[PDB]
From Swiss-Prot, chain A:
The modification (Microbial infection) ADP-ribosylthreonine is found at residue 66. This is Ubiquitin. Changing residue 68 to G: Loss of DTX3L-mediated polyubiquitination of histone H3 and H4. The modification Phosphoserine is found at residue 65. It comes from Homo sapiens (Human). It is found in: Cytoplasm; Nucleus; Mitochondrion outer membrane. Exists either covalently attached to another protein, or free (unanchored). When covalently bound, it is conjugated to target proteins via an isopeptide bond either as a monomer (monoubiquitin), a polymer linked via different Lys residues of the ubiquitin (polyubiquitin chains) or a linear polymer linked via the initiator Met of the ubiquitin (linear polyubiquitin chains).
UniProtKB/Swiss-Prot annotation, chain B:
In oocytes, accumulates in early egg chambers where it is enriched until stages 9-10, localizing mainly to the posterior pole and anterior margin (at protein level). After stage 10 it is no longer detected in the oocyte (at protein level). In embryos, ubiquitously expressed in the early stages (stages 2 to 5) (at protein level). Expression levels decrease at later stages and becomes restricted to the brain and nerve cord from stage 9 (at protein level). Relatively higher levels of expression in the head compared to the body. Enriched in the dorsomedial (DM) dopaminergic neurons. E3 ubiquitin-protein ligase which accepts ubiquitin from E2 ubiquitin-conjugating enzymes in the form of a thioester and then directly transfers the ubiquitin to targeted substrates, such as Paris, Marf, Opa1, Miro, pnut, Septin1, Tom20 and porin. Mediates monoubiquitination as well as 'Lys-6', 'Lys-11', 'Lys-48'-linked and 'Lys-63'-linked polyubiquitination of substrates, depending on the context. Belongs to the RBR family. Parkin subfamily. It is found in: Mitochondrion; Cytoplasm, Cytosol. Forms an E3 ubiquitin ligase complex with E2 ubiquitin-conjugating enzymes. Interacts with Pink1. Interacts with Marf. Interacts with Paris. Interacts with septins Septin1 and pnut. The chain holds residues 410 to 482 of 482 of the full protein. Disruption phenotype: Pupal lethal; large percentage fail to enclose. Escapers that develop into adults display various phenotypes that appear to be the result of mitochondrial abnormalities and/or mitochondrial dysfunction. This is E3 ubiquitin-protein ligase parkin.
Amino acid sequence: MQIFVKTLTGKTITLEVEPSDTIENVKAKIQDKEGIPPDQQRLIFAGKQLEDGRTLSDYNIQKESTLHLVLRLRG
Amino acid sequence: TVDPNRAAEARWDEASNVTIKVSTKPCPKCRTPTERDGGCMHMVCTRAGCGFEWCWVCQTEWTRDCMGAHWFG
Ligand SMILES: [Zn+2]
Ligand SMILES: [Zn+2]
């Protein structure tokens, strides 16, 4: 399935993922094409945060769903 | 006397936009919330159409006065 990852920039990205994909693998797949580190990826899905140890099924994330990517700073 | 437009691609983006605006401070130059970890006051605006470095407390640019007076909290 295709999902949409909407960054705080306005650049929305396409990403192909399975319902069984772990949130860790979703962040690694964002790092591959965007260069963005997974430890700097705060994924938000309708107020709820995505924990790396969960899957897309654990949040009921289907195809065409739009995730929020918040970029964490180190200060 | 007119058929209303129908869509479902809403509410998830809205509730995410509301939650971020209350949990993170808006960038002074672009009104876009920017995440903050740890306790350094050195904030770098995560919007590419911005790059603006700002003091988390002072809401103004990053400067040596902010480095001596409150680099962290
Ligand atoms: Zn900004
Ligand atoms: Zn300051």
